Scaffold this active site. Structure first.
Site, PDB file in Angstrom:
ATOM      1  N   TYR A  27       1.096  -1.234  -0.250  1.00 10.76           N
ATOM      2  CA  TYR A  27      -0.198   0.392  -0.151  1.00 10.76           C
ATOM      3  C   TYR A  27       0.627   1.581  -0.463  1.00 10.76           C
ATOM      4  O   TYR A  27       2.517   0.856   0.437  1.00 10.76           O
ATOM      5  CB  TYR A  27      -0.647   0.169   1.392  1.00 10.76           C
ATOM      6  CG  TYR A  27      -0.487   0.316   2.445  1.00 10.76           C
ATOM      7  CD1 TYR A  27       0.089  -0.789   3.223  1.00 10.76           C
ATOM      8  CD2 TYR A  27      -0.210   1.469   3.583  1.00 10.76           C
ATOM      9  CE1 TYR A  27       0.815  -0.280   4.453  1.00 10.76           C
ATOM     10  CE2 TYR A  27      -0.163   1.425   4.208  1.00 10.76           C
ATOM     11  CZ  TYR A  27       0.586   0.734   4.892  1.00 10.76           C
ATOM     12  OH  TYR A  27       0.916   0.785   6.084  1.00 10.76           O
ATOM     13  N   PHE A  37       2.023   9.857   3.385  1.00 14.44           N
ATOM     14  CA  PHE A  37       2.347  10.449   4.608  1.00 14.44           C
ATOM     15  C   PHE A  37       2.754   8.527   4.814  1.00 14.44           C
ATOM     16  O   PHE A  37       3.919   8.446   5.817  1.00 14.44           O
ATOM     17  CB  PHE A  37       0.979  10.690   5.192  1.00 14.44           C
ATOM     18  CG  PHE A  37       0.228   9.997   5.871  1.00 14.44           C
ATOM     19  CD1 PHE A  37       0.150   8.508   5.601  1.00 14.44           C
ATOM     20  CD2 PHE A  37      -1.354  10.121   4.240  1.00 14.44           C
ATOM     21  CE1 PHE A  37      -1.308   7.785   5.465  1.00 14.44           C
ATOM     22  CE2 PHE A  37      -1.992   9.317   4.190  1.00 14.44           C
ATOM     23  CZ  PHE A  37      -2.383   8.265   4.789  1.00 14.44           C
ATOM     24  N   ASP A  38       2.679   7.763   4.600  1.00  7.79           N
ATOM     25  CA  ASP A  38       3.416   6.188   4.085  1.00  7.79           C
ATOM     26  C   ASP A  38       2.997   5.595   2.984  1.00  7.79           C
ATOM     27  O   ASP A  38       2.022   5.215   2.657  1.00  7.79           O
ATOM     28  CB  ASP A  38       2.429   5.589   5.700  1.00  7.79           C
ATOM     29  CG  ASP A  38       3.080   4.865   5.947  1.00  7.79           C
ATOM     30  OD1 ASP A  38       4.191   4.509   6.283  1.00  7.79           O
ATOM     31  OD2 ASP A  38       2.321   3.531   5.743  1.00  7.79           O
ATOM     32  N   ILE A  57      -8.441   1.027  10.316  1.00  4.75           N
ATOM     33  CA  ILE A  57      -9.349   1.402   9.892  1.00  4.75           C
ATOM     34  C   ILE A  57     -10.820   1.334   9.082  1.00  4.75           C
ATOM     35  O   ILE A  57     -11.104   0.656   8.310  1.00  4.75           O
ATOM     36  CB  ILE A  57      -9.612   3.710   9.715  1.00  4.75           C
ATOM     37  CG1 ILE A  57      -8.163   2.878   8.341  1.00  4.75           C
ATOM     38  CG2 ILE A  57      -8.099   4.184  10.549  1.00  4.75           C
ATOM     39  CD1 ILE A  57      -8.331   4.574   7.879  1.00  4.75           C
ATOM     40  N   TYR A  83      -9.415   8.936  10.211  1.00  4.29           N
ATOM     41  CA  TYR A  83      -9.469   8.665  11.456  1.00  4.29           C
ATOM     42  C   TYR A  83     -10.289  10.180  12.240  1.00  4.29           C
ATOM     43  O   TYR A  83     -10.246   9.911  13.059  1.00  4.29           O
ATOM     44  CB  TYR A  83      -7.761   9.879  12.129  1.00  4.29           C
ATOM     45  CG  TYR A  83      -7.110   8.658  11.527  1.00  4.29           C
ATOM     46  CD1 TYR A  83      -6.758   6.777  12.617  1.00  4.29           C
ATOM     47  CD2 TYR A  83      -5.666   8.043  10.382  1.00  4.29           C
ATOM     48  CE1 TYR A  83      -5.542   6.153  11.802  1.00  4.29           C
ATOM     49  CE2 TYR A  83      -5.977   7.295   9.820  1.00  4.29           C
ATOM     50  CZ  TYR A  83      -4.658   5.950  10.661  1.00  4.29           C
ATOM     51  OH  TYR A  83      -4.186   5.291  10.382  1.00  4.29           O
ATOM     52  N   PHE A 100      -5.825   5.968  -0.782  1.00  6.55           N
ATOM     53  CA  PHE A 100      -4.827   4.659  -0.021  1.00  6.55           C
ATOM     54  C   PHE A 100      -4.465   4.131  -1.619  1.00  6.55           C
ATOM     55  O   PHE A 100      -5.735   3.823  -1.966  1.00  6.55           O
ATOM     56  CB  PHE A 100      -5.306   4.122   1.013  1.00  6.55           C
ATOM     57  CG  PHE A 100      -4.966   4.619   2.468  1.00  6.55           C
ATOM     58  CD1 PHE A 100      -3.584   3.612   2.946  1.00  6.55           C
ATOM     59  CD2 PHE A 100      -5.554   5.323   3.367  1.00  6.55           C
ATOM     60  CE1 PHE A 100      -3.251   4.258   3.920  1.00  6.55           C
ATOM     61  CE2 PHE A 100      -5.301   5.659   4.566  1.00  6.55           C
ATOM     62  CZ  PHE A 100      -3.854   5.155   4.341  1.00  6.55           C
TER      63      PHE A 100
END
Ligand SMILES: CO[C@H]1C[C@@H]2CC[C@@H](C)[C@@](O)(O2)C(=O)C(=O)N2CCCC[C@H]2C(=O)O[C@H]([C@H](C)C[C@@H]2CC[C@@H](O)[C@H](OC)C2)C[C@@H](OC)[C@H](C)/C=C(\C)[C@@H](O)[C@@H](OC)C(=O)[C@H](C)C[C@H](C)/C=C/C=C/C=C/1C
Lengths: 108, 95
Positions: A27, A37-38, A57, A83, A100
């Protein structure tokens, strides 16, 4: 609200991730503007998780379930499913629309 | 169902810590469950099963503490996530 999914590449169709099985994926999470961010692709190791046990999530809990095996897709997750009002301090701010990219490689 | 061995303690300890930090944003509460477990490693292993745990996971856990100490000095949450990447690695292998 919700989680708008848009496919990049198609899966096999028949094989889905049931409750109990461990979804092995790659991912890439990035913010509403574009910034990243990731990402597991940059680390060169896939990410495993047990679906159905409230581990991740709500966008992933419904979004990854609907995906079939060997399918890349773009999950535009809403702040209701993400979130939200609290967020995740110093990474995800309040009321963020998380984009994502994700590829379900192996059911395991 | 009371955690005597180190792998049993580290399993439910990291599960409690992860719930506090990621689920509830409780950074202080996350350290209060972590810091005693790390302190017992620092005292050292007694049994064979404690020694074999320390050979496997002890280097990874001590590094996860070093990243946690880097968060305390700096304040940048990116350092705290690097600790939690190592904590997740040891959790799955115990699980
Ligand atoms: C440093 O690595 C971090 C992940 C970083 C952390 C920062 C993020 C911005 C992000 O960079 O990932 C990111 O990109 C992201 O947004 N991700 C990750 C991939 C899936 C989607 C989403 C994403 O859902 O992640 C999740 C959210 C954070 C908390 C969840 C959201 C749902 C909510 O009900 C839950 O309440 C308890 C908190 C983090 C998960 O990790 C997959 C980890 C594995 C799960 C938990 C913390 C909890 O479930 C936990 O419970 C007690 C568990 O059961 C596990 C199995 C216990 C175990 C000890 C935990 C280890 C910690 C691992 C941390 C890792 C791997």
């Amino acid at each position: 609200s919700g989680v708008q999914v848009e496919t990049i590449s198609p899966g096999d169709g028949r094989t889905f991730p049931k409750r109990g099985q461990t979804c092995v994926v790659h991912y890439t999470g990035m913010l509403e503007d574009g910034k990243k961010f990731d990402s597991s692709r940059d680390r060169n190791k896939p990410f495993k998780f047990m679906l159905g046990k409230q581990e991740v999530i709500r966008g992933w809990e419904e979004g990854v379930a609907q995906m079939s095996v060997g399918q890349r897709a773009k999950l535009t997750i809403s702040p209701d499913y993400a979130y939200g009002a609290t967020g995740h301090p110093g990474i995800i701010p309040p009321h963020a629309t998380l984009v994502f990219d994700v590829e379900l490689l192996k059911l395991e | 169902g009371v955690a005597i061995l180190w792998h049993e303690m580290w399993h439910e300890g990291l599960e409690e810590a992860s719930r506090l930090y990621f689920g509830e944003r409780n950074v202080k509460g996350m350290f209060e469950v972590l810091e005693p477990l790390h302190a017992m490693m620092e005292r050292g292993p007694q049994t064979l099963k404690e020694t074999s745990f320390n050979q496997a996971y002890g280097r990874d856990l001590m590094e996860a503490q070093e990243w946690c100490r880097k968060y305390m000095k700096s304040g940048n949450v990116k350092d705290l996530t690097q600790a939690w990447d190592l904590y997740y690695h040891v959790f799955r292998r115990i699980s």
